[PDB]
Amino acid sequence: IEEGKLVIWINGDKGYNGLAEVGKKFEKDTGIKVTVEHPDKLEEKFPQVAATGDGPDIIFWAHDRFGGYAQSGLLAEITPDKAFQDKLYPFTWDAVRYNGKLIAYPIAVEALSLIYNKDLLPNPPKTWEEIPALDKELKAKGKSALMFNLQEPYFTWPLIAADGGYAFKYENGKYDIKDVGVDNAGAKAGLTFLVDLIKNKHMNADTDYSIAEAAFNKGETAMTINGPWAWSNIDTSKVNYGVTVLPTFKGQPSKPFVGVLSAGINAASPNKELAKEFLENYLLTDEGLEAVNKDKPLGAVALKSYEEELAKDPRIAATMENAQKGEIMPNIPQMSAFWYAVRTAVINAASGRQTVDEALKDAQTNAAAHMRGFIDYIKSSNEQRINMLSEALEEQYSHHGNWIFLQVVYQIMRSFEQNSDSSHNLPPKGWRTQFWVVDSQFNRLVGHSGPLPKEGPRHPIRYNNEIVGWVLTTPVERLTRNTDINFD
Numbered sequence: 001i002e003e004g005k006l007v008i009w010i011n012g013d014k015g016y017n018g019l020a021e022v023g024k025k026f027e028k029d030t031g032i033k034v035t036v037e038h039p040d041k042l043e044e045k046f047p048q049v050a051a052t053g054d055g056p057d058i059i060f061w062a063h064d065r066f067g068g069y070a071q072s073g074l075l076a077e078i079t080p081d082k083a084f085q086d087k088l089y090p091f092t093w094d095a096v097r098y099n100g101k102l103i104a105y106p107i108a109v110e111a112l113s114l115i116y117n118k119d120l121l122p123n124p125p126k127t128w129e130e131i132p133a134l135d136k137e138l139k140a141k142g143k144s145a146l147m148f149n150l151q152e153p154y155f156t157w158p159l160i161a162a163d164g165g166y167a168f169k170y171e172n173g174k175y176d177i178k179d180v181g182v183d184n185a186g187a188k189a190g191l192t193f194l195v196d197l198i199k200n201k202h203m204n205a206d207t208d209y210s211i212a213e214a215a216f217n218k219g220e221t222a223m224t225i226n227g228p229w230a231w232s233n234i235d236t237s238k239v240n241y242g243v244t245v246l247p248t249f250k251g252q253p254s255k256p257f258v259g260v261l262s263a264g265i266n267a268a269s270p271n272k273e274l275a276k277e278f279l280e281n282y283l284l285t286d287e288g289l290e291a292v293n294k295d296k297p298l299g300a301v302a303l304k305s306y307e308e309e310l311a312k313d314p315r316i317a318a319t320m321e322n323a324q325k326g327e328i329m330p331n332i333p334q335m336s337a338f339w340y341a342v343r344t345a346v347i348n349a350a351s352g353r354q355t356v357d358e359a360l361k362d363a364q365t366n367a368a369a370h371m372r373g374f375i376d377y378i379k380s381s382n383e384q385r386i387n388m389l390s391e392a393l394e395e396q397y398s399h400h401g402n403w404i405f406l407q408v409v410y411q412i413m414r415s416f417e418q419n420s421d422s423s424h425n426l427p428p429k430g431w432r433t434q435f436w437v438v439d440s441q442f443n444r445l446v447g448h449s450g451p452l453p454k455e456g457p458r459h460p461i462r463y464n465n466e467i468v469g470w471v472l473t474t475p476v477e478r479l480t481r482n483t484d485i486n487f488d
Contacts, residue, residue: 006035008037008060009042009060010036011042014060015292015294019036022278047074050268060261065330065332066329071484075104076272078103078104079276087284088106106262107260107263109258109323110299111256111259111319115234116224116243118241120138120141120222121222128159129193132200145202147203147207147216148223149225156346158254160191160346161190162249164185164187164252165182167181168181168330177487178486180371189250191360199352217239225246245322255325256326256327257326258327258329299316332374332485338370341366382432382433389412393437395416433475435471438470439468453478457473
């Protein structure tokens with residue numbers, strides 16, 4: 001990666017020419033070359049090419065889960081002073097704080113909102129509990145109160161989590177993946193209120209995305225639940241709609257899944273200070289965001305300065321309000337199966353096929369069984385890797401006869417695997433346990449350079465009739481001390 005320019009990546013569907021103009025200004029002032037690119041599949045490519053020479057200095061990615069790139073060691077810790085942190089809303093900084101350290105700049109924000117038809121309903125309910133009253137009044141008109149995709153936990157979990165439902169318990173800046181909270185009181189409370197509405201002939205349990213939209217946009221229902229991608233299609237259909245806060249349940253606010261456009265600084269960039277200068281003094285400014293927004297709207301943005309202007313569009317003002325109290329979901333691989341547990345439960349409780357209490361117990365134990373399996377894999381493919389690093393270093397010693405030859409440790413692994421025709425996959429980036437190599441007197445030959453673990457797995461290398469060194473790794477649970485994940 002070259003020093004003295006900025007290479008920037010942004011998705012081809014975000015506003016890349018608008019951003020490229022913020023690049024020209026910075027290049028006008030500083031004489032620093034700024035190149036804005038939009039590769040295909042950039043979210044996939046970024047972890048693969050980050051360290052190498054084709055890595056970008058800044059990546060803009062739209063995301064929905066949180067902590068993935070940070071946990072892989074891919075992002076530099078950004079360093080705004082307290083003056084700058086105040087130019088931006090406080091919850092958006094927690095979307096980008098990973099294990100205490102800030103790792104990216106919030107740009108834009110997104111969430112689900114309550115949409116409604118102003119004509120059928122000029123006053124939208126502020127609460128969920130008042131809604132089935134709403135429903136009888138307008139059933140009388142040949143209309144329905146509310147219709148939204150019930151098939152997907154994305155839409156139903158804001159209710160189920162308002163009163164205390166949670167995916168993983170978050171205490172001490174860590175997520176505890178053993179402590180699942182999909183079968184607690186708040187969970188049952190929210191899910192029950194959901195099933196009642198269907199039993200009490202106020203919602204239809206087979207309502208999905210395509211039903212609830214087709215209705216709302218042809219008048220036949222007064223409220224829908226959807227995100228900003230919907231708006232531009234009611235606008236075609238002469239419903240006079242509004243967008244506002246999702247109803248509270250038991251007084252608590254609804255917790256939809258927050259989505260963020262972020263800018264992070266490549267941990268390998270030699271241009272981190274250049275990058276900080278461009279993002280804080282050129283992009284995260286009204287003139288800067290206005291410039292990408294003109295290319296492709298950002299929706300709600302985290303720069304208070306600009307948000308106050310943009311919220312002179314109360315839909316954009318509703319997006320922001322629904323996100324301040326929403327969910328920041330951690331990035332764990334294969335969560336789709338986790339939400340599949342929750343999805344079949346919600347489908348069954350509303351089916352009547354199960355009671356709320358006993359679908360949510362099936363959820364809690366399935367979900368928990370998926371996490372157990374996942375960690376059994378994280379655990380096995382780390383063991384595979386270290387047994388392999390061990391067998392390799394054994395044969396390397398049996399050639400040289402000393403530790404003279406010992407980032408050469410990766411070549412030794414690659415070479416040993418190639419020579420054995422061995423094809424196995426490393427564990428997901430960010431879920432790999434550390435390792436060290438030490439001679440027989442426990443002097444550090446090769447090591448991720450922290451003070452070695454006092455105890456833990458360790459494999460002897462042997463020559464002669466003696467032990468010449470050890471390969472020291474770590475149990476999977478000590479991935480706590482570097483991540484936002486807790487295995488207890």
